[PDB]
């Protein structure tokens, strides 16, 4: 099963990772049942 | 295909689906046949498993 | 395999018959007997059948009441009785064979006897 | 009660042909519980075929049903004058295994 856990926050800061605490609700389960042992991530990029 | 033809040689749609049996992801379910509420009496309840 | 069928009746109206169909060795305890009116110039109604291993014969909403249907384990031979000669009744009866099983669900009449004609004479 | 109506009542009049004899009923016959039969003038019938398209022994294969559904089809590939005969069909979906009309009487 993979389990993606999700949460939103509105923040105030240049640059740091926030202090104080926050619950991250459950937003999806997948019942996908392959092995994972690598991951990527995926960004967007502007142009003119 | 004709219209005047025999049902051996009339035409048959056919939807063949293939349901796997191990049923670990569970993408598709029945209904599951929910009833009804009775409180106030003691009851054998079983909300969602 | 050979299912001889008993001889034209000389039946007065009003009065019983019982009809002789001869099953072949090992016939009745494997096969169910089943019976066929055939009425003159006429089409194939189907009586009932004979279980000869359990005694049990089921008949037609129609038939019921007006015939009888016995079978003999011993000396294998299969018996049709008619309570009397209504005038209707005429007809040529046939004795067939069946499967009355499970895995073999084709209930067919495999093998067919002569025939027997009864009449209000000869 | 299912009842069963052969619609070709004559259409062999002295047949040379392939025929396309035909048995209906009111409820659709449950997997292929139908049989067919020849009825020799002047003799007991003989089965024909079992299921929907299962031949018989000692009968040839030239005897082939076609149905499923409302079953409904015995056609005589090459026609032989032998085996001219009433041919009558026969149910055992709830029926007490109750038969056609007859198809091919004189
Ligand atoms: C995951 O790895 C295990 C290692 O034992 C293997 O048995 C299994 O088949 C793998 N599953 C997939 C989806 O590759």
């Known amino acids: 099963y993979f389990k993606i856990y999700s949460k939103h926050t509105p923040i105030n800061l240049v640059r740091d990772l926030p202090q104080g605490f926050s619950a991250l609700e459950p937003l999806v389960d997948l019942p996908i049942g392959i092995n994972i042992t690598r991951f990527q991530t995926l960004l967007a990029l502007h142009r003119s | 295909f004709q219209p005047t033809n025999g049902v051996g040689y009339q035409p048959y749609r056919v939807v063949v689906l293939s349901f796997e049996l191990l049923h670990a992801p569970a993408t598709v379910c029945g209904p599951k046949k929910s009833t009804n509420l009775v409180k106030n009496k003691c009851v054998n309840f079983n909300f969602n498993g | 395999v050979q299912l001889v069928q008993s001889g034209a009746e000389v039946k007065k109206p009003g009065s019983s018959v019982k009809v002789s169909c001869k099953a072949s060795?090992?016939?009745?305890?494997?096969?169910?007997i089943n019976w066929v009116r055939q009425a003159p110039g006429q089409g194939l109604e189907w009586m009932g059948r004979?279980?000869?291993?359990?005694?049990?014969?089921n008949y037609a909403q129609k038939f019921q009441g007006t015939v009888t249907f016995t079978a003999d384990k011993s000396t294998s031979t299969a018996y049709m009785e008619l309570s009397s000669l209504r005038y209707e009744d005429t007809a040529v009866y046939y004795c067939?064979?069946?499967?009355?099983?499970?895995?073999?669900?084709?209930?067919?009449?495999?093998?067919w006897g002569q025939g027997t004609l009864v009449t209000v004479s000869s | 009660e299912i009842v069963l109506t052969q619609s070709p009542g004559t259409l062999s009049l002295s047949p040379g042909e392939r025929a396309t004899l035909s048995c209906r009923a009111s409820?659709?016959?449950?997997?292929?519980?139908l049989a067919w039969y020849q009825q020799k003038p002047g003799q007991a019938p003989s089965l024909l075929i079992y299921?929907?398209?299962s031949r018989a022994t000692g009968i040839p294969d030239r005897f082939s049903g076609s149905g499923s559904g409302t079953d409904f089809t015995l056609t005589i590939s090459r026609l032989e004058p032998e085996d001219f005969a009433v041919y009558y069909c026969?149910?055992?979906?709830?029926?007490?295994?109750?038969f056609g009309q007859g198809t091919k009487l004189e």
């Open positions: 409820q659709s016959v449950s997997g292929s519980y």
């Open positions: 004979i279980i000869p291993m359990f005694g049990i014969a």
């Open positions: 026969q149910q055992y979906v709830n029926s007490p295994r109750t």
């Open positions: 060795g090992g016939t009745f305890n494997t096969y169910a």
């Open positions: 067939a064979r069946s499967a009355y099983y499970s895995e073999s669900s084709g209930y067919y009449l495999d093998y």
């Open positions: 299921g929907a398209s």
